Design an enzyme around this catalytic site. Structure first.
Site, PDB file in Angstrom:
ATOM      1  N   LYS A   1       0.831  -1.202  -0.194  1.00  0.00           N
ATOM      2  CA  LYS A   1       0.067   0.002   0.028  1.00  0.00           C
ATOM      3  C   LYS A   1       0.787   1.405  -0.053  1.00  0.00           C
ATOM      4  O   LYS A   1       0.566   2.276  -0.801  1.00  0.00           O
ATOM      5  CB  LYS A   1      -0.955  -0.165   1.256  1.00  0.00           C
TER       6      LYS A   1
ATOM      7  N   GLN B   1      -4.473  -1.426   9.739  1.00  0.00           N
ATOM      8  CA  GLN B   1      -4.498  -2.609   9.108  1.00  0.00           C
ATOM      9  C   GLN B   1      -5.030  -3.662  10.233  1.00  0.00           C
ATOM     10  O   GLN B   1      -4.689  -3.514  11.321  1.00  0.00           O
ATOM     11  CB  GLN B   1      -2.873  -3.076   8.849  1.00  0.00           C
TER      12      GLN B   1
ATOM     13  N   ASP C   1     -10.950   2.657   4.179  1.00  0.00           N
ATOM     14  CA  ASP C   1     -11.635   1.396   4.244  1.00  0.00           C
ATOM     15  C   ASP C   1     -12.898   1.345   4.105  1.00  0.00           C
ATOM     16  O   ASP C   1     -13.305   0.238   3.398  1.00  0.00           O
ATOM     17  CB  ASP C   1     -10.942   0.716   5.502  1.00  0.00           C
TER      18      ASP C   1
HETATM   19  N1  LIG Z   1      -7.729  -1.969   7.297  1.00  0.00           N
HETATM   20  C1  LIG Z   1      -7.814  -3.018   6.406  1.00  0.00           C
HETATM   21  N2  LIG Z   1      -7.036  -4.184   6.912  1.00  0.00           N
HETATM   22  C2  LIG Z   1      -6.884  -5.263   6.012  1.00  0.00           C
HETATM   23  N3  LIG Z   1      -6.467  -6.505   6.273  1.00  0.00           N
HETATM   24  C3  LIG Z   1      -7.305  -4.837   4.789  1.00  0.00           C
HETATM   25  N4  LIG Z   1      -7.145  -6.017   3.431  1.00  0.00           N
HETATM   26  C4  LIG Z   1      -5.961  -6.231   2.823  1.00  0.00           C
HETATM   27  O1  LIG Z   1      -5.052  -5.412   2.899  1.00  0.00           O
HETATM   28  N5  LIG Z   1      -5.784  -7.090   1.878  1.00  0.00           N
HETATM   29  C5  LIG Z   1      -4.574  -7.506   1.030  1.00  0.00           C
HETATM   30  C6  LIG Z   1      -4.042  -6.358   0.401  1.00  0.00           C
HETATM   31  C7  LIG Z   1      -3.074  -6.655  -0.550  1.00  0.00           C
HETATM   32  C8  LIG Z   1      -2.533  -7.811  -0.741  1.00  0.00           C
HETATM   33  C9  LIG Z   1      -1.508  -7.986  -1.781  1.00  0.00           C
HETATM   34  O2  LIG Z   1      -0.703  -7.186  -1.950  1.00  0.00           O
HETATM   35  N6  LIG Z   1      -1.334  -9.122  -2.266  1.00  0.00           N
HETATM   36  C10 LIG Z   1      -0.489  -9.855  -3.224  1.00  0.00           C
HETATM   37  C11 LIG Z   1       0.567 -10.587  -2.923  1.00  0.00           C
HETATM   38  C12 LIG Z   1       1.378 -10.038  -1.597  1.00  0.00           C
HETATM   39  C13 LIG Z   1       1.948 -11.182  -0.790  1.00  0.00           C
HETATM   40  O3  LIG Z   1       1.308 -12.037  -0.360  1.00  0.00           O
HETATM   41  O4  LIG Z   1       2.992 -10.880  -0.341  1.00  0.00           O
HETATM   42  C14 LIG Z   1      -1.147 -10.678  -4.471  1.00  0.00           C
HETATM   43  O5  LIG Z   1      -2.367 -11.159  -4.144  1.00  0.00           O
HETATM   44  O6  LIG Z   1      -0.511 -10.971  -5.677  1.00  0.00           O
HETATM   45  C15 LIG Z   1      -3.307  -8.962  -0.304  1.00  0.00           C
HETATM   46  C16 LIG Z   1      -4.356  -8.828   0.509  1.00  0.00           C
HETATM   47 CL1  LIG Z   1      -5.241 -10.144   1.384  1.00  0.00          CL
HETATM   48  C17 LIG Z   1      -7.877  -3.699   4.206  1.00  0.00           C
HETATM   49  O7  LIG Z   1      -8.146  -3.503   3.051  1.00  0.00           O
HETATM   50  N7  LIG Z   1      -7.781  -2.742   5.279  1.00  0.00           N
END
Ligand SMILES: Nc1nc(N)c(NC(=O)Nc2ccc(C(=O)N[C@@H](CCC(=O)O)C(=O)O)cc2Cl)c(=O)[nH]1
Ligand SMILES: NC(=O)c1ccc[n+]([C@@H]2O[C@H](COP(=O)([O-])OP(=O)(O)OC[C@H]3O[C@@H](n4cnc5c(N)ncnc54)[C@H](O)[C@@H]3O)[C@@H](O)[C@H]2O)c1
Ligand SMILES: NC(=O)c1ccc[n+]([C@@H]2O[C@H](COP(=O)([O-])OP(=O)(O)OC[C@H]3O[C@@H](n4cnc5c(N)ncnc54)[C@H](O)[C@@H]3O)[C@@H](O)[C@H]2O)c1
Ligand SMILES: Nc1nc(N)c(NC(=O)Nc2ccc(C(=O)N[C@@H](CCC(=O)O)C(=O)O)cc2Cl)c(=O)[nH]1
Lengths: 289, 284
Positions: A53, A97, A120
């Site tokens: 992010k 997060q 969010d």
């Molecule tokens: N406040 C709050 N809390 C939360 N937990 C969330 N959710 C969230 O960030 N989800 C989320 C964001 C990015 C990825 C990503 O970069 N994925 C890559 C692989 C990277 C790797 O795995 O190393 C891929 O899919 O190729 C994956 C996920 Cl699950 C939110 O939105 N807000």
């Protein structure tokens, strides 16, 4: 054979759109947008996701900071930091997060973020407004799922959609977005949507997926969706990220032979989540809602 | 089996009456419900009178404030704000539909959330969709109570809801699919939401699998006997004299069915009484 939809390619395009919008915003004489992310503890997946992010923020020209705190932080200490950031006019977007430690109430935390900075879309008012199909800040992962479908041209009106998963931050908003009226303030997808979850028997899941034109799995269970559960030509969108090597919820190689479309894990919904957060941050900075 | 909505509502209203008597016997103020009614919709007047009759019989004080359909939005908002600040008023509801020149969402959001016995305030909608403690909308809660008190299982069952309206169909789907273990428990069922763009053939392909079909579309004979699995439960929320269900035919295929009238209708009124005593107790 199924089109593999590249979430990374789609998200990179969307970020170029946000970058241009941010540049025109700043060239118009407005302050550069700033996103604050609060990270609690050392969940490795959380640290990775927040780094993605903050990387994307730099890509699109949004200033950012991650504030990391020990898991041993108290809820009142988290609430004081959130209140500080709520009152800092330089911060346009603020997110905490998830998941948080057991001694911290996620709902109280999410509700303490000022709704205008709630990039969010987790504040209860944003949740309520979204469930009423009103203008709202949409949560990033559900919106990225919707954008994958829309930008790929996959139709939803009158179609059958199964969502595996009912979590409040992922599966429930996806089901809300896809089933609701296209004519309302925040349009929906006008699909016929089946919500399945941990108490849906595997045979009943399959009995609904086999009818589905779009299958959206957000359960967190490897090989939950397999080729025999999918009708030929169907779109399959994999929201699961399971450490098992990273797999989705979908039998990628198996379903790839039967689906019309499929997203990979990694490189599918994940980068789309990050791109839609960038869109929400410029929306927050503009005080549109 | 034909489920008697009248008999279940009678039991619920007896429970509320006992709860209200105990609450008053302990020295608290008697609960008071204020209903605002706009215009001369004959069904609305009939429904509101049913609500105020049930209030009286369970020991809840009530008043219906009737205004002409020519009332303006700011004048309705003024009346709401006075009632919001009248400490004698525990519950406040504005009967819908409102005249086309009045924005209903603005009106629903003007009722104080702690007096919002309808559960139509955006904060109550949001809390409901997050499975938190909330004032549940009365008709969706009545549907769930019919299912629970008839003893019809939901966990793991297939449920079709015909309709997606924000006041009825959407809260029904929300209640039925969500987690029994959360603050506000749900039915833990597998729920399909159909609506006006679901093709008739696709509706049947889903109802045929349903252990519980819930029709809330307002279309006469929308649910015919071929769509129904034998032994399934069919809940007619539509109100047309007749519901959405072909009552006579489906009666011979279903294991449980709900009549119109005397089905979900009286349960809506009963669940409002539950919400009113909840509001008076200021538990939320
Ligand atoms: N406040 C709050 N809390 C939360 N937990 C969330 N959710 C969230 O960030 N989800 C989320 C964001 C990015 C990825 C990503 O970069 N994925 C890559 C692989 C990277 C790797 O795995 O190393 C891929 O899919 O190729 C994956 C996920 Cl699950 C939110 O939105 N807000
Ligand atoms: N950008 C992304 O790709 C992204 C974003 C958020 C979450 N996720 C992923 O989604 C998955 C779950 O996310 P969450 O935060 O919603 O998790 P969660 O643990 O809160 O929810 C899991 C959901 O899956 C359902 N489920 C469990 N077993 C099931 C079964 N057999 N059939 C159907 N449904 C079943 C549960 O009932 C629950 O609703 C994880 O892989 C997580 O990493 C991905
Ligand atoms: N409002 C109440 O408290 C209440 C209480 C008891 C019963 N009811 C009855 O139930 C209905 C409740 O919904 P509303 O009043 O908000 O209606 P509405 O007109 O807002 O929408 C009814 C729903 O039916 C759906 N629908 C339309 N055609 C369909 C089709 N062919 N197949 C499947 N779904 C279809 C629509 O998409 C919509 O979601 C009323 O019509 C009434 O008869 C209402
Ligand atoms: N704010 C607000 N506005 C709303 N419109 C509603 N909904 C609502 O009142 N529904 C409603 C309530 C009672 C009945 C009933 O008494 N039915 C009898 C037949 C009586 C007869 O026909 O005269 C029966 O079915 O046996 C039927 C209905 Cl539809 C609400 O809850 N809140």
């Amino acid at each position: 054979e199924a089109v593999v939809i590249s979430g990374r390619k789609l998200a990179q395009q969307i970020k170029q759109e946000v970058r241009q919008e941010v540049e025109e915003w700043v060239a118009s004489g407005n302050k550069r947008p700033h996103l604050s992310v609060i990270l609690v503890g050392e969940n490795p997946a959380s640290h990775s996701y927040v780094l993605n992010k903050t990387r994307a923020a730099a890509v699109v020209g949004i200033n950012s900071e991650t504030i990391m705190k020990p898991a041993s932080i108290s809820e009142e200490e988290l609430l004081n930091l959130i209140n500080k950031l709520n009152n800092d006019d330089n911060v346009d977007g603020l997110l905490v997060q998830l998941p948080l430690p057991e001694h911290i109430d996620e709902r109280r935390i999410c509700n303490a973020v000022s709704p205008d900075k709630d990039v969010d879309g987790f504040h209860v008012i944003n949740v309520g407004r979204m469930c009423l199909d009103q203008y709202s800040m949409l949560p990033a992962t559900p919106w990225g799922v919707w954008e994958i479908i829309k930008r790929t041209g996959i139709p939803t009106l009158g179609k059958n959609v199964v969502v595996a998963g009912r979590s409040k931050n992922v599966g429930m908003p996806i089901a809300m977005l896809l089933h609701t009226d296209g004519a309302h303030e925040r349009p929906g997808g006008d699909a016929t949507v089946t919500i399945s979850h941990r108490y849906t028997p595997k045979e009943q899941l399959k009995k609904h997926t086999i009818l589905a034109d779009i299958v959206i799995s957000a359960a967190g269970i490897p090989n939950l969706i397999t080729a025999d559960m999918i009708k030929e030509g169907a779109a399959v969108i994999d929201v699961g990220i399971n450490r098992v090597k990273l797999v989705g919820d979908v039998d990628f190689e198996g379903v790839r032979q039967k689906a019309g479309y499929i997203t990979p894990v990694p490189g599918g919904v994940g980068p789309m989540t990050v791109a839609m957060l960038m869109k929400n941050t410029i929306i927050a900075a503009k005080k549109v809602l």
